[PDB]
Amino acid sequence: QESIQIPNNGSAPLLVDVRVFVSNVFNVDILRYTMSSMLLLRLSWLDTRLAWNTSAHPRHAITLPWESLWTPRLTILEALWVDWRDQSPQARVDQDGHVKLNLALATETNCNFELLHFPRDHSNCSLSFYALSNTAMELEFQAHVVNEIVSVKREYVVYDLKTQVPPQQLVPCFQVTLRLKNTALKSIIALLVPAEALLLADVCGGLLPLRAIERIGYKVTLLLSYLVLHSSLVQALPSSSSCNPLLIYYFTILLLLLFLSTIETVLLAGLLARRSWPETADRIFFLVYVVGVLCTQFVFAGIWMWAACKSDAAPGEAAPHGRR
Amino acid sequence: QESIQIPNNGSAPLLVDVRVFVSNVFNVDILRYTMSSMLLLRLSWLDTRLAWNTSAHPRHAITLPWESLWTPRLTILEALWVDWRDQSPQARVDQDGHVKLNLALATETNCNFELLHFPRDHSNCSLSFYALSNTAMELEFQAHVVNEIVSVKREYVVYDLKTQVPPQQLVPCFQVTLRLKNTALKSIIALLVPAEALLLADVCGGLLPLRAIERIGYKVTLLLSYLVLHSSLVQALPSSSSCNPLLIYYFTILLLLLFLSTIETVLLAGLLARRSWPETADRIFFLVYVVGVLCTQFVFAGIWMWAACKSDAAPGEAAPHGRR
Amino acid sequence: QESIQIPNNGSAPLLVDVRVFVSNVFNVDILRYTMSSMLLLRLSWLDTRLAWNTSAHPRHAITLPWESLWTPRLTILEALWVDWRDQSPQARVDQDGHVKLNLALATETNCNFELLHFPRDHSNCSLSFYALSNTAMELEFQAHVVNEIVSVKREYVVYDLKTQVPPQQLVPCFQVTLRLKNTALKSIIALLVPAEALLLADVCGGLLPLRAIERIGYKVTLLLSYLVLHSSLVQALPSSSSCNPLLIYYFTILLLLLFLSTIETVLLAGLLARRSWPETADRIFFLVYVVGVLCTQFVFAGIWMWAACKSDAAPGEAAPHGRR
Amino acid sequence: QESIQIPNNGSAPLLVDVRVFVSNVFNVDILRYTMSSMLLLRLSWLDTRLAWNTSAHPRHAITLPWESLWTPRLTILEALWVDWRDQSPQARVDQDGHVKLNLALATETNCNFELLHFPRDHSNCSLSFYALSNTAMELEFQAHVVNEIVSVKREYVVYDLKTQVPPQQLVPCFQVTLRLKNTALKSIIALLVPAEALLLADVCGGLLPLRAIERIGYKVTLLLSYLVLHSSLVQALPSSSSCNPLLIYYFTILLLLLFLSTIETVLLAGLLARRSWPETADRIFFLVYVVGVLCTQFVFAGIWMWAACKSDAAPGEAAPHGRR
Amino acid sequence: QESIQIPNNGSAPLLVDVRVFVSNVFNVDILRYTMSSMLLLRLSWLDTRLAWNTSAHPRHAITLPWESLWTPRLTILEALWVDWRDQSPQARVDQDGHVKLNLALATETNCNFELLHFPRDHSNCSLSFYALSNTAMELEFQAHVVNEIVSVKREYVVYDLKTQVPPQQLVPCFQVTLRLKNTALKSIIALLVPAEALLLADVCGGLLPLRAIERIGYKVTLLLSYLVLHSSLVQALPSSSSCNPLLIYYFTILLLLLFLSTIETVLLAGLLARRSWPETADRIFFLVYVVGVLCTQFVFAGIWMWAACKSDAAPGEAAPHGRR
């Protein structure tokens, strides 16, 4: 039973060098706030109890079941699920006692996406590997990350990868932090361009005379089209607790503007049916509406240029597990 | 085989201290009435049979397979599925016999959502860990919960967490109760604002004269838009057996109001085609319809302020498993 | 190897008492004809070989791995998948040899839904636990069901639960039969109310004069709305091989009625464009159409009150596995 | 280690009798070309090494772990995934050495659907169980199929089941072939009836005069409705590599016909706006369009009655695994 | 423990011959950039330690558990998940020491799809099997691929399969490269034909006079139809980081063209309402719009004929794992 026990480095804790290869980051689900990735962990340590004389055994390296010798069990706190692609990994031990273990795992880990500037948003995703069964006085970690992502043509691109060992911890752990940027043009072309086109179409349709019967139907059909587009957007974009994306607010403002234009058109047409004052009011409202649309565009551009989110840290983030 | 047996505390049952860390609550599916969460359970007890003299073994703590020594098997009744993120957990035993076991598990547990006040609804979710293979006279539980949720920017926010050991039980168990509040603005902006806008647009379109050919098409297009919106809402909101959400009733009432307005407009236009009495009837109905819309808004606001649901407890809730 | 063998009761087969607790019935998928449930099975039998003298062993009860002593392996024929929430269950054995085993399992079992009277339909769901590896002369079952469902606020409510041991069987098995009733108002409000409203709107729009240009557009927009609603319904309702739901036939009849009204309106308007006879024909058709709509409503109400389905039993139902 | 080895029948290979019970065929996904089924395999063979004298052991039958004695491992080539509903099956051995093993498995197997005549299409689904670890000179199979399907009220009904052992094979295998017929009326009512109704409505709307302003809007609204219906159909029907369903071609032809009618109406109305020749051309085109619609209906009916698909066999079908 | 060790070929590394049978390629998800396949790997090597004299053991071949003798553990870097359809594979060893192992596995592997020419696009999918626990000086691979795909009637057809052992590698691995071509007509008929039909309909509707009230509604309804179609396309097509499909750009250009036509029509109609110059401007714009539509068609055809994508290789592709 002593073989299964963690090797004793002496007064200092045992040092395990971890090399992390990020094979891919495939699913990035903003709706579920989850990021899916594939990792290869190479864990290397020294176990002098496993060292053998080369004269007795000619082999320079052997393979042993992971349940025979001591292997540090790693658990990811943020991972919704972990799938280890090896049922029973085999640890490779050199003649000097160096033990190297290779683990391939696909993990769906929780990531806090800052979706305020969607679609051009940047987020930080953290994968914290914890050795729950061990203590900091017994185990120490050196984590190195190697960028080996096999796919680059995706909506989200990882552009910064790093590893850190947080100080003042009781449970030994290492955190791999990556930065995700969204470069997908699907959302923009899908929603923003049709929305701007519909808004400009409504602005130009405001030129139609009040007495024309084709103006009301035109405006209402545009309103229905924008209602469909807004429904698609809101069903597509996730809703945060504190910092919702600016796009939903922008589309809500545009929807209210289109509704206001349609209601004004219908009300003034009805009043005129019962240059009269409805026509002058319609012209004044058209000028005011064009000015307001331009002002709304400029104000939202300024907001997008200078918006900030002071999202309060979650209890897990503010007070992480296994510290002090 | 005696090692696998539960330790004997004597006349009193063995005491196990359970510390629960809620890492995240990620999926909250109202349609399926399920809540998905990640938990870390630290179970600590005393096993004097495992105590060893420090002189014989210099190690101050050892790690053993969970199938070697006695580990209490915990089963969650409400959990649709449980995924233990460790294939074979390792129990850490101190020199004095104290055994500590760390279990990381992702569970999809049944939660009874009170959806009457959707979207601003509060619900209670309970996770009941049961030691089915043991009896109350043999095992006792002390459950402590620590709020370590890593994500706060989600639709549902946990704002109250507690643990309890129900009295007069035959199967030892402990229940973790959490409170879920919905702070998502996606539903409101998606549905309520377009619905109110369409209702006000129909009210203002009632101003159009009966003889106008543009009024019927306007009202029917608005009716189609609200039909699409109502279909989206009803396909989005789940249906409870007894207390359905107030939103579906509100949207049904608004849909009936819009249908009544359209049918009145069409009928009176047809009668007029065959100040005449259809025009006076149209004006009277317009006044009555505006008054009725305002009254419906006020009555539903009052209902929302003072609605209650005396939802009868389920047989599992009224008569919980393993009691007396 | 004799311990793993089934205990010998003598000439009579061994008797196993099974207590079934239905924790929840969560997914009821009519489209897939599957019902998902969670069950707790307490299996109790007598094994005199495991009995021990209390003088030798002070323990009054012990726990053993399920692979050490004989445990009856239960297989569900109708279950699409079974998930046993315990990797290795532990059997509790008393000093007298009584063995009790607790198994928690989540099962997706096939259920034959009688969807003729959707949404107010009642169905029978059967879960047949079979001991395939054993014979009837060796194993006997006593099955008891306890209603411990934890959620009652769902679309489908279980209102009758029972257990039975079919006679003249070769493979020992026990069947848990439950009755599912649908109390969801989502389908009704979603589909029936808009359908009736659109039908009545078309009936009232038949009042519009033939020469009016607003009648054709009104009827066609209503037709498009009902086409969308009918598409939503047919994509929502499953299609049985023999007894399809009455709702799809009702909506098809209403869709044909609306198409007939629109085609008549367009044809007579075109003929009139080229009191004339088209107007008299339009009035006669309007009267006939109102009468036909009322007659269709009454006839379908009578059919719903007196419809029956003599659905032929499936080969598995007519000839169940392991009989004679 | 000799117990695990396959029993020696002598010069002839060992004979294993396989009885297959098809409990259900639940998912039949045309889009993924996969069919999901549940099977119970009873494998019986003779192992004289396991025979015991009744005098020494009074038991007439024993149960052994499947990893103790030789059990043929069966692999399905077409199965996307297999789920064995028993973690560790137990083999029942009689006193004479007869070994019977019961395996319950849910499999998602690839099936080549002939979707040319959708929805009234017939397909052949094959499940090939292979003993990869064994050779034909060592193992032989006798496969019998019993129709025990528990659900008959589904879209696809199995009406023919058979088993075969292909000749001239090196890897012992047996193939269960079943015939699937689609009896679902959901697709027909959902798509064909609305399509025919819209086509006839457009034909009747061709009666409207060219100078009428209501004709263009009518035709365009019908065109939009048929566009929505065609989009729903094409997103519903899968696309084969060589033999696509006739329904998509039929709906494409109808969509082109409706577009041609709308374009002709708009062009001639515009030319007339600038009995004149546009009116005579419109009447001639109306007659030609009615004749063409009738001819298209008759030609497609004849094609449906006499269409054939000589789909080239896949490399796996033409050259099956483990032959010669 | 020496049996589990890799056999020693001497100075040269041990040679393992791998035969790969591709049973099927079923899911090809462009949105997730993943390809799902089923493979059968036959791994053959020589282990003289397992050779036995035929005089002692009459058997010419034996079967052993994969955990008894040395079996090379293969890991796929690009595979999102791997499902080995055998819980415990059995290795067949001949009398001369030749060991053959058959592994059936269903894998979802990452594939970089070149979607620039969608739907008629060709892509390369690579499956890299790595022996992480071994070194190149100890293990060598010979990989052979056999095309045994059981389904050919799918959207994506594999038309080229090959195997390669990359040179200058430290971790022994072999790569199976296949070529995927899309032959599905679902996308074309679904989107391109309706888009071209709507564009030509708008072009022909430009013939309508400016003063006509039916022109604006016609153009706006066509615009709404194309908006729905464009939304369906963009929600259907995935978005790459660098080389988006040409279809989304084409549909965006067509949508902008339709919006420009509608805005011009509405603006000039409004100006005319307030041969006049609006009519001459409308005719000139109609000619310019027809010319521009034809020019856009020709330019996009030329682009499609001569477009190229120099997609930069991903860090995993440029620097593959286990080299030098």
Ligand SMILES: *[C@@H]1O[C@H](CO)[C@@H](O[C@@H]2O[C@H](CO)[C@@H](O)[C@H](O)[C@H]2NC(C)=O)[C@H](O)[C@H]1NC(C)=O
């Ligand atoms: C045992 O503890 C010592 C001290 O922490 C470790 O030695 C350190 O190793 C790292 C990198 O390998 C160096 O950066 C430090 O400078 C070293 N410190 C000293 C005092 O030497 C040693 O690696 C540990 N050995 C094992 C097997 O864990």
Ligand SMILES: *[C@@H]1O[C@H](CO)[C@@H](O[C@@H]2O[C@H](CO)[C@@H](O)[C@H](O)[C@H]2NC(C)=O)[C@H](O)[C@H]1NC(C)=O
């Ligand atoms: C054995 O039983 C005793 C009595 O229940 C336990 O002692 C109690 O422990 C809790 C907290 O540890 C205290 O709140 C009580 O005051 C204690 N009661 C008494 C009489 O001392 C004891 O913890 C149990 N020991 C084990 C190993 O389970």
Ligand SMILES: *[C@@H]1O[C@H](CO)[C@@H](O[C@@H]2O[C@H](CO)[C@@H](O)[C@H](O)[C@H]2NC(C)=O)[C@H](O)[C@H]1NC(C)=O
């Ligand atoms: C052995 O067989 C006998 C006879 O079937 C079983 O005794 C019956 O038990 C049930 C309920 O426990 C009673 O309803 C019957 O009246 C009993 N019949 C007789 C003749 O006693 C007995 O339970 C079986 N014992 C075991 C361990 O299986």
Ligand SMILES: *[C@@H]1O[C@H](CO)[C@@H](O[C@@H]2O[C@H](CO)[C@@H](O)[C@H](O)[C@H]2NC(C)=O)[C@H](O)[C@H]1NC(C)=O
């Ligand atoms: C051993 O081989 C013989 C010959 O194939 C098998 O005997 C045959 O069994 C089948 C059905 O059981 C009969 O249809 C044949 O007529 C039999 N042939 C002969 C020559 O007898 C025998 O079943 C095999 N025994 C075992 C244990 O596999």
Ligand SMILES: *[C@@H]1O[C@H](CO)[C@@H](O[C@@H]2O[C@H](CO)[C@@H](O)[C@H](O)[C@H]2NC(C)=O)[C@H](O)[C@H]1NC(C)=O
């Ligand atoms: C041991 O190493 C030798 C040399 O690599 C292997 O022999 C080669 O085998 C391949 C195909 O089997 C031939 O193409 C080469 O020509 C052979 N080279 C020589 C020098 O013979 C041999 O296969 C290896 N043996 C084992 C068990 O791995």
Ligand SMILES: *[C@@H]1O[C@H](CO)[C@@H](O)[C@H](O)[C@H]1NC(C)=O
């Ligand atoms: C992400 O982490 C880095 C520190 O490594 C920090 O500078 C940056 O502000 C973070 N970005 C976001 C969007 O949180």
Ligand SMILES: *[C@@H]1O[C@H](CO)[C@@H](O)[C@H](O)[C@H]1NC(C)=O
């Ligand atoms: C939830 O539980 C608390 C008791 O802890 C209770 O006071 C409260 O009424 C419950 N809330 C709901 C919505 O049931």
Ligand SMILES: *[C@@H]1O[C@H](CO)[C@@H](O)[C@H](O)[C@H]1NC(C)=O
């Ligand atoms: C369900 O089973 C009961 C018998 O327990 C039977 O009386 C009833 O007719 C069945 N109901 C249906 C809808 O099949």
Ligand SMILES: *[C@@H]1O[C@H](CO)[C@@H](O)[C@H](O)[C@H]1NC(C)=O
């Ligand atoms: C299916 O298999 C049978 C032979 O058993 C064959 O006669 C028939 O033509 C096949 N049907 C189809 C649609 O391939």
Ligand SMILES: *[C@@H]1O[C@H](CO)[C@@H](O)[C@H](O)[C@H]1NC(C)=O
């Ligand atoms: C795919 O791989 C082959 C080499 O085998 C190469 O010639 C070809 O250009 C590649 N095709 C694509 C689309 O990358």
